[PDB]
Design a protein around this nucleic acid. Structure first.
Ligand SMILES: [Mg+2]
Ligand SMILES: [Mg+2]
Ligand SMILES: [Mg+2]
Ligand SMILES: [Mg+2]
Ligand SMILES: [Mg+2]
Ligand SMILES: [Mg+2]
Ligand SMILES: [Mg+2]
Ligand SMILES: [Mg+2]
Ligand SMILES: [Mg+2]
Ligand SMILES: [Mg+2]
Ligand SMILES: [Mg+2]
Ligand SMILES: [Mg+2]
Ligand SMILES: [Mg+2]
Lengths: 95, 120, 324, 52, 109, 116
RNA sequence: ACCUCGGAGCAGAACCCAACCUCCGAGCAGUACAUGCUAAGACUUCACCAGUCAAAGCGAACCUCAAUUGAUCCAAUAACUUGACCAACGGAACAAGUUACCCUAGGG
RNA sequence: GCCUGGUGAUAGCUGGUUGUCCAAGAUAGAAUCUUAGUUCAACUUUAAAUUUGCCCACAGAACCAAAUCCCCUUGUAAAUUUAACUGUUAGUCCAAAGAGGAACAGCUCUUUGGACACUAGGAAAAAACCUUGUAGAGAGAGUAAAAAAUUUAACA
RNA sequence: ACCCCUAUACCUUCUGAUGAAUUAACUAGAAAUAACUUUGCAAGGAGAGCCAAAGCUAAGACCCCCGAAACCAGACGA
């Protein structure tokens, strides 16, 4: 990525990352599964049910996506009727 | 392939000839072993290195007391080529709290609970 | 490294050189028979069962059936398969001959012996008959292991049995509210002359069965005792509680059990009447509570789980707002 | 040899689903299940999508 | 002229050895042909994989094999046997740990 | 498992034989494969007698390889049934043949001819 | 000659294990149209991506095969969906021969 | 062509990277216009939280050898999780089981285990064989491994 | 002092040839996203903007040197 831009001297986000992923405020990245809309005629319904899911990301995938976006994308967002809003705070972890 | 070696049980069954050779009684056997490392764990597999660390025999020529129970005997059977085992014999009793400081394990295998430095 | 088998291996003795000289299972059914026999045998390997477990009679019977097959309408009806059987004769003669062993099976299956006598099995020789009055017309019979409502069992039943003293006992093997071991009796009539019941010494008088709501389905024991020498004995549920084992231990010298009939009860509205009216307490209501569902330990990064994973581990389904 | 065709529901409409059928046999009509009507309904095939 | 054969290991075999506590739905063992058969409280997938249907402890036994009568392969294999010959297989069982619920007092109405 | 005492409890292929001259060596003597032709002007007596032969042979523990029939001939029609047999004893040759002799219904002939 | 996927041996008994190592195969076909929707718990090709199995539930009745395959972007489509022998099969959106004139940076 | 500029061109390649002292630390792999490289993993390191880890006994793991998995006791003291990152990988040889080759190669390719890229003693010299490990001074002592052994043919 | 005994130069590149006559001087690790440590204040922090379900503010602490053939633009050259 660009660590220091030529105009501002700031970091830049990679906009592929924003275009594909969802950062929850607790640090979890949500994604969509690869091939969830390809060749559905030859996939069993169990597999199609698996592909139509919002799948969390790895730890190192998560840290790779944190480094590729900026602090704007890491921020609390109090939207109006947000579908994912109950998934931001992390309930009831025992580490 | 070089693997871990099972040893059959006939190897660990004494004969009356052996009771004549060493000083053992099959009835009323000994409670405590003295184990000493007399060979290196270098050039030995990692499992033998581990068993030597568990039994507390990292330093060679240093005696260690163990129980004569089948668990400890199982670990001893794994590294029986690196060690030396003798029965801990006790001519007088096991040491009381009076004789706790003034002991000495002799070379014979006995543990004397009054260790003066005078001649008899 | 082979270790040799402990006992005999299966398929050893039949293993010969000439299989074609050995006659085979031509069917599926014969293999199922032999196979079930080998299932029931004790083996030395680990099996499922370890973990989850006079002359005049034959004379009159031979002449009786020999006279029975000789009639032409019996053969003609039986070959046209319109012959039937009178169920009543079979019922009463079953009550006579081999009924006691079957009532022994039903008492062993319903756990009356492991609970009522700590495993002391016996045989109900007496063909006892108990029935509860259902109004004035009909009457609900008690056979071994039936379902009878406590409305039907509101009033003490009619007991008829063909015999010649007696002590009759009713208990509720499971209906005990406090102690998980004892049982509330319901009526214990003693020193009974012959086969009339009314002239018995009513020691503990009749309660109806009271199973609590949602506490499942109860079994209720009618013991009937051959008494030799007439002995003297002895709404508070601390007073209806005893155990039939050490009760019978006090009196097993001159008394032996001779009859069973037991039945099931569930809740009904009459049991509301029993708890409130005549016991004078609030009724207890039970519910069958299943154990909470296992979920594994929650991870920081639940890799590849769906988004539903965060809901397995939350406890409120309402928007929490935190410090704001 | 086979064709991937779409099947359009006759009622509770706008619902399609794809099937395979031979190049040579007739135009399929089926009884599939509409989750819009939430019933089994005849579907009629309307267009071949791809000759697999 | 020997092309192909570069397939990797399937990583099959037993996942829960005998004595292991098992929760409901855990895969006990994945096989390619029926090395182990489902016994008590053990289910089978389309891939012949044995999973668990209750929470409990896995046990392996040896049982009499009596196939379904509509299974003409194994049934035709039966009828060729001599008269004492009885087939055995190894089965997997889950001995269920918990009771399936308790009665609990709810209210004194 | 290969080291447990219950190894090979599940084997079965030694219990199925999943697979010609006469054997008359020194003491244990037996015929090879045979052929028994049954010719009659009746389908009924030839078929039924072939049944009686076949049920005798199954009731006396004999390998009966086939029980086919030969085609008929334009003459009246002559019918044939071939019921093969392999393996008899010295006594059992006599005792086996005497019953087939002593059980013929009506004008149906025999053959103890062998293969080819 | 090959490049991806599967079976067997190597690799005898949990898992894994190479080779321009030894032998077979695959790139489909058939049936069904609840091959609907949801969902505990798991396995996993040594990562990831992909893959697999699945009880309970709602709704109904009363899949076989081992492999039988292709990401993202982009297109086409109202939508549902569909799109590569992208086979160099983790795939650059589209680029051949040759240099004893070769040149540079290096390695043997 | 040559010069100046772009220009500190670019270089997965070569070469080089400067005080002290201590500590912990070496060999699975998967993809890749990839095999002179990177990314993920494995291994490694620090910090943190917790609770088990390792060794293992019966029992147990399929039909068509050596062993391993599993595993309470016991002997021990570690392990997992959380946070943060770098680096390393055609290893070599020996013992063993094998494959290719000539049952050649200091040849090629897997597996198990050692050792070496960490010390000292021995084997003539000596990466890899044997003995041996944890660090200093001593003009003390006991040991370990450790030295090749052989010499022949009358005949009735 | 030598004689006695012990002792296969250093760097770098490989699992285990390179460069250096010698001296002096010159000559090669640049970034604070996140985490950690230490303060301040604390449901708030910050000297507007920004973050906040114990956070925020401040500081400390991490990212080398030399080397092509080339390509392009403009000149200077018979
Ligand atoms: Mg293979
Ligand atoms: Mg492979
Ligand atoms: Mg994996
Ligand atoms: Mg390629
Ligand atoms: Mg590729
Ligand atoms: Mg440069
Ligand atoms: Mg480069
Ligand atoms: Mg160190
Ligand atoms: Mg490519
Ligand atoms: Mg490279
Ligand atoms: Mg354990
Ligand atoms: Mg230097
Ligand atoms: Mg001029």
């Amino acid at each position: 990525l660009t660590y220091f831009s030529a105009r501002k001297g700031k970091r830049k986000t990679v906009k592929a990352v924003i275009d594909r992923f969802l950062r929850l405020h607790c640090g979890l990245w949500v994604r969509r599964k690869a091939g969830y809309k390809k060749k559905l005629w030859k996939k069993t319904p169990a597999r199609k049910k698996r592909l139509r899911e919002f799948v969390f990301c790895n730890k190192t995938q998560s840290k790779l996506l944190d480094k590729m976006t900026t602090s704007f994308w890491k921020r609390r967002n109090w939207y109006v009727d947000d579908p994912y809003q109950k998934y931001h705070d992390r309930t009831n972890l025992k580490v | 392939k070089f693997t871990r070696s099972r040893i059959p049980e006939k190897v660990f069954q004494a004969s009356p000839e052996d009771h004549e050779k060493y000083g053992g009684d099959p009835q009323n056997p000994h409670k405590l072993h003295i184990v000493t490392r007399i060979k290196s764990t270098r050039r030995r597999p990692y499992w033998e290195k581990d068993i030597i660390k568990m039994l507390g025999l990292e330093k060679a020529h240093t005696p260690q007391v163990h129980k004569n129970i089948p668990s400890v005997n199982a670990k001893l059977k794994v590294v029986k080529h690196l060690i030396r085992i003798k029965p801990l014999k006790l001519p007088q009793g096991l040491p009381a709290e009076e004789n706790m400081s003034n002991t000495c394990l002799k070379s014979t295998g006995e543990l004397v609970v009054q260790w003066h430095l005078k001649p008899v | 490294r082979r270790t040799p088998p402990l006992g005999p291996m299966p398929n050893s003795d039949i293993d010969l050189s000439n299989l074609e000289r050995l006659e085979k299972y031509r069917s599926f059914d014969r293999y199922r028979r032999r196979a079930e026999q080998e299932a029931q045998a004790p083996h030395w390997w680990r099996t499922y069962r370890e973990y989850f477990g006079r002359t005049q009679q034959l004379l009159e019977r031979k002449q009786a059936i020999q006279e029975l097959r000789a009639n032409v309408e019996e053969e003609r009806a039986a070959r046209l398969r319109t012959a039937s059987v009178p169920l009543d004769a079979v019922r009463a003669e079953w009550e006579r001959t081999c009924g006691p062993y079957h009532k022994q099976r039903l008492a062993e299956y319903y756990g009356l012996y492991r609970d009522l006598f700590h495993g002391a099995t016996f045989v109900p020789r007496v063909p006892l008959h108990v029935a509860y009055a259902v109004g004035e017309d009909d009457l609900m019979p008690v056979y071994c292991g039936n379902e009878v409502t406590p409305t039907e069992a509101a009033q003490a039943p009619e007991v008829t049995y063909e015999a010649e003293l007696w002590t009759l006992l009713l208990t509720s093997l499971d209906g005990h509210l406090l102690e998980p071991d004892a049982e509330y009796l319901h009526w214990l009539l003693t020193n009974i002359p012959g086969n009339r019941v009314a002239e018995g010494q009513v020691t503990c008088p009749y309660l109806p069965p009271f199973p609590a709501r949602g506490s499942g389905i109860h079994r209720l024991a009618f013991l009937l005792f051959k008494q030799d020498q007439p002995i003297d004995f002895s709404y508070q549920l601390a007073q209806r509680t005893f155990r039939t084992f050490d009760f019978y231990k006090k009196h097993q010298e001159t008394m032996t059990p001779a009859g069973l009939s037991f039945f099931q009860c569930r809740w009904d509205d009459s049991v509301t009447y029993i708890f409130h009216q005549l016991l004078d307490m609030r009724e207890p209501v039970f519910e069958f509570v299943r154990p909470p569902p296992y979920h594994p330990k929650q991870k920081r990064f639940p890799h590849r789980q769906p988004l539903r994973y965060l809901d397995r581990y939350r406890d409120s389904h309402e928007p929490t707002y935190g410090i704001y | 040899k086979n064709i991937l065709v779409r099947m359009v529901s006759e009622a509770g409409t706008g619902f399609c689903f794809n099937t395979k059928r031979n190049r040579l046999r007739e135009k399929l009509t089926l009884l599939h299940y509409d989750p819009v009507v939430k019933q089994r309904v005849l579907f009629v095939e309307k267009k071949k999508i791809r000759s697999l | 002229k020997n092309l192909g054969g570069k397939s990797s290991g399937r990583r099959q075999g037993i996942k829960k050895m005998e004595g292991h506590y098992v929760h409901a739905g855990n895969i006990i063992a994945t096989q390619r042909h029926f090395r182990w058969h489902p016994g008590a409280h053990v289910g089978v997938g389309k891939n012949k994989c044995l999973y668990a249907l209750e929470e409990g402890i896995v046990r392996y036994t040896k049982e009499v094999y009596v196939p379904h009568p509509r299974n003409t392969e194994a049934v035709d294999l039966i009828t060729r046997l001599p008269k004492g010959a009885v087939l055995y297989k190894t089965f997997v069982h889950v001995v269920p740990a918990k009771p399936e619920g308790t009665f609990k007092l709810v209210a004194m109405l | 498992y290969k080291t447990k005492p219950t190894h090979g409890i599940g084997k079965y292929k030694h219990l199925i034989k999943a697979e010609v001259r006469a054997i008359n060596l020194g003491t244990d003597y037996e015929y090879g494969v045979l052929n028994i032709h049954l010719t009659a002007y009746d389908m009924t007596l030839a078929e039924s007698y072939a049944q009686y032969v076949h049920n005798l042979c199954n009731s006396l523990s004999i390998k009966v390889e086939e029980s086919y029939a030969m085609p008929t001939k334009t003459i009246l029609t002559t019918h044939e049934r071939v019921v093969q047999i392999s393996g008899l004893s010295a006594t059992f040759a006599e005792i086996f043949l005497e019953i087939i002799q002593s059980s013929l219904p009506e004008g149906v002939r025999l053959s103890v001819k062998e293969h080819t």
